[PDB]
Nucleic acid binder design. Structure first.
Length: 194
RNA sequence: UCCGCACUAAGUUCGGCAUCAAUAUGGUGACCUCCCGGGAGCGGGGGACCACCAGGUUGCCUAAGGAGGGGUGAACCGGCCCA
């Protein structure tokens, strides 16, 4: 139904090491959270000695929790990419795996976006996921030095964030304004690089 | 505050399975094919295909696929230096 992806990710990253710049602990926590969610809802991927490719269909979205699985997959991919960003200063080889991982991060984001097109999901989650996917696509295109698509995605995501902030009270719009302030320097730097 | 309770929500600890590919250059090891010379052992030069290591741009790649570290390397079947 209705979910607050931004609130969940903000409450998760600010309390699991990322508040001071720690990515190993956040990645470990995300992996443990994914494992616990898989065990809790009986979402086993492969049995003993065998593996089967699972899929999140619209029929099983009635639990209002399978969104968190794909969200945590995307968050883990993003954390891995930003972790390799730190170690890419002295290891030039890490960049290829960094980009190969963020390319799958955008795939996870677009999967979580496309699974929300059904009527079982309210209008808030769809718009929030669209903003998240736009931000992720912009980050991906910026990291590959593609400026036009990155700035287009950044414009879309900031427009959605501003509309969402205007839709609510000023007490709760602070987080959306913070996200806008976080993404503005990237847009300005990309424009300056041109 | 007590519960052999129910599920949701985070961590301790121990096992099992699996852990990618293309492109440019150079190198090693098998095998194949063109030559020049020589009274032998052979010497010099050019290519086709496979495996691997280091290492630069990448992906119609996955739930992921480190350019990580170690050991065995066997019966004579990885070669090197070979009494």
């Amino acid at each position: 139904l209705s979910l607050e992806i931004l609130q969940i990710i903000k409450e998760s990253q600010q309390q699991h090491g990322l508040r001071h710049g720690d990515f190993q602990r956040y990645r470990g926590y995300c992996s443990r959270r994914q494992r616990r969610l898989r065990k809790t809802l009986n979402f086993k991927m492969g049995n003993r000695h065998k593996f089967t490719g699972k899929k999140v269909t619209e029929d099983l979205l009635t639990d209002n929790r399978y969104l968190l699985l794909v969200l945590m997959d995307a968050e883990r991919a993003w954390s891995y990419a930003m972790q390799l960003k730190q170690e890419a200063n002295t290891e030039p080889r890490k960049r290829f795996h960094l980009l190969s991982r963020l390319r799958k991060a955008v795939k996870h984001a677009e999967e979580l976006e496309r699974l929300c097109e059904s009527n079982r999901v309210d209008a808030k989650t769809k718009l929030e996921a669209q903003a998240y996917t736009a931000y992720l696509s912009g980050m991906l295109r910026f990291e590959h030095q593609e400026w036009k698509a990155a700035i287009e995605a950044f414009n879309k995501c900031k427009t959605i964030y501003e509309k969402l902030a205007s839709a609510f009270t000023e007490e709760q719009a602070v987080l959306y304004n913070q996200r806008v302030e976080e993404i503005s320097p990237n847009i300005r730097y990309c424009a300056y690089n041109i």
